[PDB]
Amino acid sequence: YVQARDDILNGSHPVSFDKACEFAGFQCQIQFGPHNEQKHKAGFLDLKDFLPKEYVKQKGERKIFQAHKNCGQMSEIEAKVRYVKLARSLKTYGVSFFLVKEKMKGKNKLVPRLLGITKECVMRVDEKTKEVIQEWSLTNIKRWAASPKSFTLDFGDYQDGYYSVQTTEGEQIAQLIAGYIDIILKKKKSPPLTSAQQALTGTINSSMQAVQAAQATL
């Protein structure tokens, strides 16, 4: 429960603001009763604790409280199991996440999307939507390389024109790739002549024979 809560605090985990509110309901029930959140409304202990920084800035007003009511009389272990299963339901698990801004197709703008990667597949999730925008498996990868600022994501020949990811920590992601591509290894079972010069020379010829022709015409 608490480690998934911590991943929530990271913002790595794909959680909707609404989904964050239901997790906040679970947390308010495991930490207090339904009436406490009814007693007082401010609750950074409801906001700061339950939510990541963007969500506390979102100042979740009373959808969180309604999620509390929905949890209501569920025991601490009841909401704990609910939270755990709800967190497992997302494809978030076994998966690494990295906040990145990526060149959006059509024109030079950078899209806010999350780098969700598991040991065997690579997803693609918008940070403001928390659903996967595009998906791949490890198998699909046929090449890779990371700049200090980005990384190359070979989606194989099937995908037309992969998109690279602009990443500060891209080299760390590439060492992950080394660790990632480890699973595929585990699966396996035991001059005087220049191009410019020659083009120049062909031009020279073309010209000289043209010269001979011109002289003859003369």
Partner 1 sequence: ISPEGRAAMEPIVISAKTMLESAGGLIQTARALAVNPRDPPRWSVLAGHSRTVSDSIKKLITSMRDKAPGQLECETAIAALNSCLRDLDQASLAAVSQQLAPREGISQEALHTQMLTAVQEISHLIEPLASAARAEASQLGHKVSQMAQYFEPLTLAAVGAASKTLSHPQQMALLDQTKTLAESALQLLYTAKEAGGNPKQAAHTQEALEEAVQMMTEAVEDLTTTLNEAASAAGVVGGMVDSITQAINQLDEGPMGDPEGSFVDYQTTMVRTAKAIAVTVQEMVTKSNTSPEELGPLANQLTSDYGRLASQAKPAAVAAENEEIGAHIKHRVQELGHGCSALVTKAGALQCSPSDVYTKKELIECARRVSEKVSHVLAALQAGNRGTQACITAASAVSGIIADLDTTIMFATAGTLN
Rule CB under 8 A: which residues touch partner 1? 103, 105-108, 143, 145-147, 149-152, 160-162, 164, 194-196, 199
Torsion of CA 31, 36, 37, 40, to 10 degrees: -130
Q: How many CB atoms lie within 10 A of CB 63?
A: 15
Contact between residue 67 and residue 25 where contact means Cβ atoms under 8 Å apart: yes
User: Any alpha helices (H) in 90-159, and if so which ranges?
Assistant: none
Judged by beta carbon, residue 95 or residue 146, the one nearer partner 1 is: 146
Judged by beta carbon, residue 29 or residue 167, the one nearer partner 1 is: 167
The distance of closest approach from Cβ of residue 191 to partner 1 in the complex, given in angstroms and rounded to an integer, is 13
Sole residue written with tokens 């498996």: 137
The distance of closest approach from Cβ of residue 2 to partner 1 in the complex, given in angstroms and rounded to an integer, is 39
**DSSP secondary-structure letter at 95?**
E
Q: Which residues contact 209 (CB under 8 A, 6 or more apart)?
A: none
Judged by beta carbon, residue 52 or residue 170, the one nearer partner 1 is: 170
Judged by beta carbon, residue 38 or residue 203, the one nearer partner 1 is: 203
Locate 98 and state its tokens.
């990295």
The distance of closest approach from Cβ of residue 205 to partner 1 in the complex, given in angstroms and rounded to an integer, is 18
The distance of closest approach from Cβ of residue 93 to partner 1 in the complex, given in angstroms and rounded to an integer, is 30
The distance of closest approach from Cβ of residue 142 to partner 1 in the complex, given in angstroms and rounded to an integer, is 11
List the strands of the sheet with 165-166, edge to edge.
144-146, 150-153, 165-166
Summarize the chain as % helix, strand, coil (round to 5).
45, 15, 40
Last residue before each break in the chain (C–N > 2.5 Å):
190
Judged by beta carbon, residue 178 or residue 214, the one nearer partner 1 is: 178
Contact between residue 63 and residue 100 where contact means Cβ atoms under 8 Å apart: no
The distance of closest approach from Cβ of residue 120 to partner 1 in the complex, given in angstroms and rounded to an integer, is 23
Q: What angle do CA 95, 76, 52 make, to 5 degrees?
A: 40
Judged by beta carbon, residue 88 or residue 109, the one nearer partner 1 is: 109
